[PDB]
Amino acid sequence: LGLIKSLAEKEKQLLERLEAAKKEAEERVKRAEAEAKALLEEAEAKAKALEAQYRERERAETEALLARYRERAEAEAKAVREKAMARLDEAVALVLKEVLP
Amino acid sequence: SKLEAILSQEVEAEIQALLQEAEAKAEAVKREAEEKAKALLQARERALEAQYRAALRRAESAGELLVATARTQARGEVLEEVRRRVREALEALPQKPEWPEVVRKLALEALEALPGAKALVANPEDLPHLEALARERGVELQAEPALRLGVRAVGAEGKTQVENSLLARLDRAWDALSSKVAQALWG
Ligand SMILES: [Ca+2]
Ligand SMILES: [Ca+2]
Ligand SMILES: [Ca+2]
Ligand SMILES: [Ca+2]
Ligand SMILES: [Ca+2]
């Protein structure tokens, strides 16, 4: 029978068609999944660049700030000595008064 | 037949639905990744700002501490200079006219602290200043060459002893004195 041979042919085309539809579906989703993964990987990279910029700025600003404060420290130390010089005499007489009978 | 057309349509519609759902799925996945990427970067930036602020705040704390450490150091050096000057003055004091009086006062205080004392001990150069005070009390006078800037009283037969020394008075009281000085000078 030619029916049996054409039934074989028809089975074959059904299968190729199911297969082709499944492969096209899979490709659409795998393409979107890959594009998604690249989008997020790129976004992580921007985030890491931004982080690095912040890290460099932290180092620089912390160093510049500790330098300004050291200079403020030096000056404040000078002010302490300068202000003590005015009443040095009084301080020495004060101690001698406390210590003598 | 009717059934054959129905089934042919079933196969077509199953394939059609598989393909439209795959497309809708692809678009949903991309849209989602877009929104996520955007949200992530904005959240991250805000978090970074906050961290940077805290970093600057810690640095500042460090700086202020550095200023405070400097002031404390400076005061310390001033206080030591005051101490050095006090000690130099005390060292010079025995050459001055009022030294005998200071010696007499140190002896009185030593006697107050050891009223049973039988002798006062002082440097040989200082004894003559105590002669009359000791005679009035009836207590003996003894020379100690290794002793200066002070007077000792001794009870019994050397059983007990009290020392009234200007350098030791300075040294023992310096912790509190330094606070009094700091209030006078600054605070
Ligand atoms: Ca007092
Ligand atoms: Ca149709
Ligand atoms: Ca159709
Ligand atoms: Ca259709
Ligand atoms: Ca007393």
UniProtKB/Swiss-Prot annotation, chain B:
**Entry's Gene Ontology molecular function annotations:** ATP binding; proton-transporting ATP synthase activity, rotational mechanism; proton-transporting ATPase activity, rotational mechanism
**Coiled coil residues, start to end:** none
Source species, domain of life: Bacteria
Keyword Zinc among record annotations: no
Q: Set out the biological process GO terms recorded for this chain's protein.
A: proton motive force-driven plasma membrane ATP synthesis
Give the signal peptide range.
none
Gene Ontology annotations for the cellular component aspect, listed alphabetically: proton-transporting two-sector ATPase complex, catalytic domain
Query: Matching Pfam families, A to Z?
Result: vATP-synt_E (PF01991)
UniProt keyword list:
ATP synthesis, Hydrogen ion transport, Ion transport, Transport
* HAMAP family reported for this sequence: ATP_synth_E_arch (MF_00311)
- Described purpose of this protein according to its UniProt entry: Produces ATP from ADP in the presence of a proton gradient across the membrane.
Similarity comment text for this entry: Belongs to the V-ATPase E subunit family.
Recorded protein name is: V-type ATP synthase subunit E
